[PDB]
């Protein structure tokens, strides 16, 4: 693991015209920050083991080898995705925003500015 | 140990800072190196802590490759029971700042001259 990245956007937070999440985003960013700091903290890697020399200094040297093989050959799986609708249940609710609220909002605007012109006249 | 202090001439006064990571310290009673400064206070206020964190702090400097900030740390423990000391050692260990560190330890135990001597010892070692 390894995971990529989007910066704070406070404008975003407030707006969520899916009302059922309005609070959540404020809290959810702060949950994020928990991860953000936590990841920035740690490195990815320990070292490894020179089993040859440790076998020299372990008289039960079989052990070093056995655990060596199992460990070094082993790879444990990255904590696995369960959710990826985020992108989606957004970008669709972002259309929800645009088309649905874009159109209605832009069409309203036009009438306003249309009467003003003649009101400047 | 009994080697006496040098003269005037083999010195050059300070003009380096010395840093502890302790904001207050470094700021307000800003310290340099070669100096002498009293830590004065009562008991386990992290009595020690003060030193420790500083030392740990020097770790990054010791992780520097300086010798302007790469600071070899010397800890004289006078009268400090082994347990305390143990913890202490351990703390450094944990911090492993110990690698650039002597810990001269005359714990609580030690027949009196021993505690007495230790500083001087540390001193020679530091000179």
């Amino acid at each position: 693991r390894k995971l990529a990245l989007k910066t704070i956007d406070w404008v975003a937070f407030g707006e969520i015209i899916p009302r059922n999440q309005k609070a959540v985003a404020n809290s959810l960013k702060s949950w994020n920050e928990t991860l953000t700091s936590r990841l920035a903290t740690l490195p990815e890697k320990p070292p490894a083991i020179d089993w040859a020399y440790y076998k020299a200094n372990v008289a039960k040297a079989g052990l070093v080898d056995d655990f060596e093989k199992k460990f070094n050959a082993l790879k444990v799986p990255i904590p696995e995705d369960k959710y990826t609708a985020q992108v989606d249940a957004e970008e669709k609710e972002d259309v929800k925003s645009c088309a649905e609220f874009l159109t209605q909002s832009k069409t309203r605007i036009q009438e306003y500015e249309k009467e003003l012109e003649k009101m400047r006249n | 140990v009994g080697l006496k202090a040098p003269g005037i001439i083999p010195r050059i006064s300070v003009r380096e800072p010395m840093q502890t990571g302790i904001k207050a310290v470094d700021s307000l009673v800003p310290i340099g190196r070669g100096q002498r400064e009293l830590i004065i206070g009562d008991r386990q206020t992290g009595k020690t802590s003060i030193a420790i964190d500083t030392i740990i702090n020097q770790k990054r400097f010791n992780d520097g490759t300086d010798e302007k900030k790469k600071l070899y740390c010397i800890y004289v423990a006078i009268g400090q029971k082994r347990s305390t000391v143990a913890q202490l050692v351990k703390r450094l260990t944990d911090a492993d700042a110990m690698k650039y560190t002597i810990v001269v330890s005359a714990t609580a135990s030690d027949a009196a001259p021993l505690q007495y001597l230790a500083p001087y010892s540390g001193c020679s070692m530091g000179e």
Partner: protein, 127 residues
Amino acid sequence: KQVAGTMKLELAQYREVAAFAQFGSDLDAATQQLLSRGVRLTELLKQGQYSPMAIEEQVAVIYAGVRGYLDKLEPSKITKFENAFLSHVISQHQALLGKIRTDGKISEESDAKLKEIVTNFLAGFEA
């Protein structure tokens, strides 16, 4: 030196303003600010048990308060902020950190880098 001179001074009054026209309770904004600020600075220097740090960071955060930028907030959030601010800068303004460390000083530019950064960080702290 750049923040601290002033700060020391400021604290001096701040501490002082506990004694003239106060032994413990009274009011006026000008001065209240000084207190507020002061209180903040207190936090800002308030560095709990266990804390090795690097000076520019320290300055970094210090700068925020000195340059009056959080006065607003409560102490409680300072620390939190400070931390937060730290990963932020650490990460991002690692650039900047590079610089400040380098210059041994904060250049005016680096300052500016702070100014927006901090403001923004604060803002980010919201916003």
